[PDB]
């Protein structure tokens, strides 16, 4: 008795009708640029892992960002490269400028067009109600695009949203966990950051889709309008689901598990307990009340749902009343 199959409600077959070269990253041949074009200027507080630097293109004195990919699984590298190249020029997507490698160590690096290195996490506490809606809308522009291009980001979080507030420009970055969506395909659930993992990842449901990014976006929104970062603050993957269940309730969780015939890790039995669904108004207080509205709560309610199929798509999200003034001002 295995799990019930699932399909994305939107963009389900975008990759099936595209040439093979588009999504078949393993057959992609990487073309190397000249590493001598670039010199490191200063290290950036990023993943602190596969390390990222501010750099300069000394051939034209343009500022760039360099991401050295150490260690080196070759398959994961080609995936990120292919996705970056596929999405290049798209709305609010970071631009891959070049690909180089150390002639000696053979260690590859990506070179990105320069982006103002303030992340949504640094920016949000100073933003008004309107600005949050504005930037949330901008993020939806990027997600709807990448989803329409048959790609799920799978690592949506404040750290991966670069914002130049001066020029009101936004870029979605770090596509190292991103993947092509193919209807019916089972994916690895060990993706995203713990605080932004969807219930599908936590209960080990592999046939997930773009809607994973929408849960992550919901976590971001909740943390910002309620001023509680991160909103679901688990100490591990197991506790993470517990933190969610204390808000969304255990009844809908078990409805979700039943609906898709999911086999829950038996270790959840003694930790999950029984919890009522909490009204969103419970998280509202004097310090955050200026960021909360009936529209924000309704919008949030339609993102943070166990059932990935029931969550708003990126496109449906952009049509929500929460963004009415933003859309009207854009025209």
């Amino acid at each position: 008795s295995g799990p019930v199959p699932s399909r994305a409600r939107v963009y389900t077959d975008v990759n099936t009708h595209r040439p093979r070269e588009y999504w078949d990253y393993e057959s992609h041949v990487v073309e190397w640029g000249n590493q001598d074009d670039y010199q490191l200027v200063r290290k950036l507080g990023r993943g602190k892992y596969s390390e990222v630097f501010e750099a300069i293109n000394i051939t034209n004195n343009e500022k760039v960002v360099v991401k050295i990919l150490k260690p080196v699984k070759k398959k994961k590298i080609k995936r990120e490269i292919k996705i970056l190249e596929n999405l290049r020029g798209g709305p609010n997507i970071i631009t891959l400028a070049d690909i180089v490698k150390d002639p000696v160590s053979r260690t590859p690096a990506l070179v990105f067009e320069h982006v103002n290195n303030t992340d949504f996490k640094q920016l949000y506490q100073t933003l008004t109600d309107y600005d949050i809606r504005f930037y949330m809308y901008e993020i939806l522009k990027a997600l709807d695009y990448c989803h329409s291009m048959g790609i799920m980001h799978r690592d949506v979080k404040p750290h991966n949203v670069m914002i130049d507030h001066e020029h009101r420009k936004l870029r979605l970055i770090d596509w190292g966990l991103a993947e092509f969506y193919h209807p019916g395909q089972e994916y690895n659930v060990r993706v995203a950051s713990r605080y932004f993992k969807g219930p599908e990842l936590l209960v080990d449901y592999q046939m997930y889709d773009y809607s994973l990014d929408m849960w992550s976006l919901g976590c971001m929104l909740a943390s910002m309008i309620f001023r509680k970062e991160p909103f679901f603050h688990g100490h591990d993957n197991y506790d993470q689901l517990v933190r969610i269940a204390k808000v969304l309730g255990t009844e809908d969780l078990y409805d979700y598990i039943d609906k898709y015939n999911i086999e829950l890790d038996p270790r959840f039995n003694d930790i999950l307990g029984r919890h009522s669904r909490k009204r969103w108004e419970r998280f509202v207080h004097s310090e955050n009340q200026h960021l909360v509205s009936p529209e924000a709560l309704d919008f949030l309610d339609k993102l943070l749902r166990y059932d990935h199929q029931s969550r708003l798509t990126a496109r449906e999200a952009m049509e929500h009343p929460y963004f009415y003034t933003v859309v009207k001002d854009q025209a």
Binding site: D36, Q39, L40, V41, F53, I68, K70, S105, T107
Partner: peptide, 13 residues
């Protein structure tokens, strides 16, 4: 030692 994974460090040595 002004090289880091092949890259020269800007302004080094």
């Amino acid at each position: 030692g002004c090289r880091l994974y092949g890259f020269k460090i800007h302004g080094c040595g």
